[PDB]
């Protein structure tokens, strides 16, 4: 019985990794993730210039999940590139490097420079599309023409296999259109579903107040709130993008939640809010819980059940 | 102390009602809602002809909420019109009638017939904008040009104050666009936020199966999953539509949940999943719990705290 995967020309001890943005901003964070029993790690989504991000409080968690409007705080691309080229120990586990430029030009500038490091050290690119572009327009992956433009330009500039982090969709027509855009780009080899459920609002009844400062308290939702949404998006893209891998992200707190993602079609499984709350210890627990479920069902490998969710009649 | 209120030229004993689709399909349901302690009731969204809906199982509930792909089963517009015209006791509480035709033409035809009954009896119209659109396009409320057409055509055909039931939005640009559409229409006097969070997927780990039969197990989410989504949409519309009322729907299980909706800007609060699960007794509990929160805070009226959610700095 084993959790091993081989994909994207890399070998992974198990499918678990951090979600971008959690436990991955600083060298200390990245060394912590590397020391953990995760099968991989992803570095904080970065911009060309470092960013302090939004005023605090900008993240809060609760029993059912989390809300955040972090404002993309990060050490800048040069730092994450250095980590990739010089500091990471690839013998421990593979590394993903997430980028999230604020314009298509900023993404192209970063991927051009990433490429030789990707080719030489084998770091894998995750491009974050669940990101702002022009204020007053939708985030990039909610504007299909902007999305196509970003993917054309990054495909040209990078020239190597990469993946994309997608926001959740809620309408079948959007699943259809979004997958068809992705399917234009053969270098897009994996699709991570999903980023936070956008612009929720948490209100504390006692104080009669919102809980985060930016955007009058509106921010992205993660955790138990979003698991069915995340499974829907994993499965929708799994069904529509047969030549791509799907990575699942959203609502994983247990080996059972991981198992559901994998039945929906997930290859790797990312953990955000639960990791933020529990710490990197969570990965040993997740592995143990998922292996217990596999043993009770007689499953020896992940491929025995990946994408095999049953439908009714 | 009592929770009585006046809006849309009607008087309401309290701000609670069922959500469209729950406990409101049949004469028996409507009589049960009428006998409850709710302040108002809304009938099932209807089409010109009766519909059986989708194959079962089509609704399932869990500790954190519900998933449905009902397929709009309903008795037909003639039935709900007759209910509004001849059977409902308006001395007991106000009635809302929800319409959701499969085309603009069908909606116009229904509203032309409802208008004289709205005039004579005071039934209120809730137009459900999660209704199907032309090939390739998302539901009507997600296609702003279609939504503008529907509202123009209904406004002309109906000619009286009405409301609209909205799906959730997840993007601030979308809130801006959607609100500006609604704000073109002076007859749109209330906006209900929100319908179910679209196309989630619930999977049972033991059986490795989805839990509803239609659409390969994909369906709308309600209940605890959606409360922060619901509050964001209530507040976004409350901020953007100063000349309209906002009705909150989503995630209400307690007076505290109702209190949060009202703080976010809700005038009436609709109960869906929790009503389906707990039954019509829930209305007396909700009233008691909301009054108890008011008493502890020193609030004597809903008006004292409606829309008064505090932001940070
Ligand atoms: C504090 C915080 C920061 C995040 N920053 C990023 C980011 O920089 N890039 C990104 O792609 N997603 C970001 N996310 C989203 C997570 O990667 C993840 O998609 C989302 O939280 C859902 O997973 P969960 O339910 O496990 O939290 C962030 C999430 C949190 C909570
Ligand atoms: C079984 C079922 C049937 C529903 N049918 C309708 C409907 O016919 N029209 C409509 O506007 N919303 C319909 N809804 C959506 C609800 O009115 C409500 O907006 C949604 O369930 C979220 O509220 P909740 O969190 O309280 O469930 C339905 C919901 C359920 C669960
Ligand atoms: C104000 O500047 C930004 C920059 C990045 C943002 C992003 C992208 C970064 C990001 C963030 C974040 O940094 O806020 N949070 C997530 O849950 N997922 C993400 O992908 C989302 C929403 C608002 C943003 C505002
Ligand atoms: C052709 O099958 C459909 C399915 C859903 C429909 C709907 C949505 C009805 C609805 C349903 C539903 O009955 O599935 N469930 C919800 O959670 N919200 C709703 O608003 C409106 C108009 C026509 C429709 C036709």
């Amino acid at each position: 019985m084993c959790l091993k995967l081989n994909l994207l020309d890399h070998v992974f001890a198990n499918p678990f990794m951090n979600a971008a943005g959690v436990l991955c901003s600083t060298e200390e964070d990245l060394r912590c993730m590397t020391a953990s029993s995760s099968g991989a790690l992803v570095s904080k989504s970065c911009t060309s210039a470092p960013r302090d991000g939004n005023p605090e409080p900008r993240y809060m968690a609760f029993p059912l999940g989390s809300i955040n409007s972090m404002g993309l705080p990060n050490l800048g691309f040069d730092f994450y590139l250095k980590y990739a080229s010089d500091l990471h120990d690839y013998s421990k586990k593979p590394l993903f490097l997430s980028i999230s430029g604020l314009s298509v030009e900023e993404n192209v500038a970063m991927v051009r420079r990433l490429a030789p490091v990707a080719q030489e050290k084998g770091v894998l690119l995750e491009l974050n599309l669940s990101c702002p572009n022009v204020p007053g327009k939708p985030q990039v992956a909610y504007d299909f023409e902007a999305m196509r433009t970003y993917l054309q330009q990054v495909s040209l500039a990078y020239g190597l296999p990469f993946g994309v982090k997608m926001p959740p969709y809620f309408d079948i027509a959007h699943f259809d259109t979004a997958a068809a855009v992705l399917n234009e780009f053969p270098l897009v080899k994996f699709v991570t579903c999903v980023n936070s459920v956008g612009n929720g609002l948490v209100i504390d009844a006692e104080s009669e107040s919102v809980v985060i400062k930016p955007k009058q308290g509106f921010g992205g939702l993660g955790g138990k709130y979003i698991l069915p949404t995340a499974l829907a998006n994993v499965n929708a893209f799994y069904r529509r993008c047969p030549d791509k891998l799907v990575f699942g992200c959203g609502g994983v707190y247990s080996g059972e939640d991981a198992f559901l993602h994998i039945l929906a079609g997930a290859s790797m499984v990312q953990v955000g809010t639960a990791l933020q709350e529990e710490g990197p210890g969570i990965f040993t627990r997740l592995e143990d819980e998922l292996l217990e479920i596999m043993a009770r069902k007689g499953y020896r490998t992940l491929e025995e059940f990946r994408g095999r969710v049953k439908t009714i009649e």
Side-chain angles (χ1 to χ4, degrees), chain A:
Chain A
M1 191 158 69
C2 81
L3 308 179
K4 193 175 168 180
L5 320 86
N6 266 227
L7 53 88
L8 296 170
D9 206 37
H10 295 251
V11 179
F12 297 87
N14 65 72
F16 297 108
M17 55 186 295
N18 64 305
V22 174
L23 201 52
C24 66
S25 289
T26 65
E27 185 172 327
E28 172 190 335
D29 296 338
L30 293 166
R31 284 182 196 279
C32 183
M33 273 307 301
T34 301
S36 82
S37 56
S38 77
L41 79 171
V42 58
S43 55
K44 177 64 186 166
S45 292
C46 64
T47 47
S48 280
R51 295 172 63 81
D52 294 334
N54 282 337
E56 285 175 329
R58 59 197 187 175
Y59 169 84
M60 290 290 307
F62 301 96
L64 293 176
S66 74
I67 188 168
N68 88 80
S69 290
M70 296 303 290
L72 237 181
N74 73 97
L75 299 180
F77 174 75
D78 286 342
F79 172 81
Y80 303 108
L81 191 61
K82 179 193 280 65
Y83 178 78
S85 54
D86 304 346
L87 308 175
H88 192 243
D89 188 356
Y90 297 82
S91 80
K92 299 288 178 198
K93 62 193 71 173
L95 176 67
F96 300 82
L97 194 158
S98 170
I99 72 167
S100 191
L102 305 184
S103 64
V104 70
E105 297 80 4
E106 198 188 349
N107 286 316
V108 166
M110 291 185 275
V111 303
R112 282 210 239 92
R113 306 173 50 225
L114 183 47
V117 181
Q119 207 170 313
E120 169 53 3
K121 297 289 213 291
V123 60
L124 293 161
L125 169 68
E126 187 181 79
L127 174 68
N128 180 16
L129 293 175
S130 350
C131 83
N133 186 14
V134 170
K137 302 205 90 180
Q139 59 156 297
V140 172
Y142 288 171
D143 177 346
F144 295 118
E145 207 26 82
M147 188 181 117
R148 178 178 287 113
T149 295
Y150 276 46
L151 298 169
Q152 285 176 166
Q153 301 254 261
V154 173
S155 292
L156 192 56
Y158 193 56
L160 301 158
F162 64 106
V164 298
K165 173 83 166 277
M166 309 287 287
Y169 301 97
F170 303 92
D171 187 291
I172 298 307
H174 296 159
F175 294 149
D176 289 348
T177 303
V181 176
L182 299 182
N183 285 331
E184 302 175 18
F185 297 97
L187 295 170
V188 176
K189 302 303 193 199
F190 74 91
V191 179
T192 306
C193 299
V194 298
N195 212 311
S196 27
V197 166
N199 288 299
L201 183 65
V202 166
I203 305 174
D204 174 66
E206 187 300 315
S207 63
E208 301 177 21
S209 181
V210 310
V211 304
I212 62 166
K213 173 159 176 173
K215 290 162 75 163
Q216 301 177 114
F218 289 65
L221 303 169
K224 310 193 182 260
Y225 298 112
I226 79 161
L227 173 65
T229 295
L231 296 177
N233 275 259
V234 170
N235 193 59
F237 285 87
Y238 182 71
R239 288 186 184 276
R240 284 162 181 76
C241 296
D243 297 332
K244 301 190 195 299
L245 296 169
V246 180
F247 294 3
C249 189
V252 180
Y253 287 75
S254 68
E256 188 159 289
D257 306 328
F259 180 68
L260 300 179
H261 271 270
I262 295 165
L263 286 171
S267 284
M268 301 301 287
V269 174
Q270 310 190 335
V271 191
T273 296
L275 171 62
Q276 179 63 214
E277 287 318 288
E278 184 172 332
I282 193 172
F283 294 115
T284 61
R285 180 167 65 79
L286 297 175
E287 290 151 30
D288 287 349
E289 283 177 355
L290 178 52
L291 288 161
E292 177 67 357
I293 294 166
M294 295 168 62
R296 180 200 310 146
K297 292 169 172 291
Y299 288 134
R300 290 180 297 172
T301 65
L302 295 178
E303 317 82 62
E304 278 186 79
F305 63 100
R306 175 179 309 118
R308 301 305 192 75
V309 58
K310 300 173 194 187
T311 56
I312 304 168
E313 312 185 273

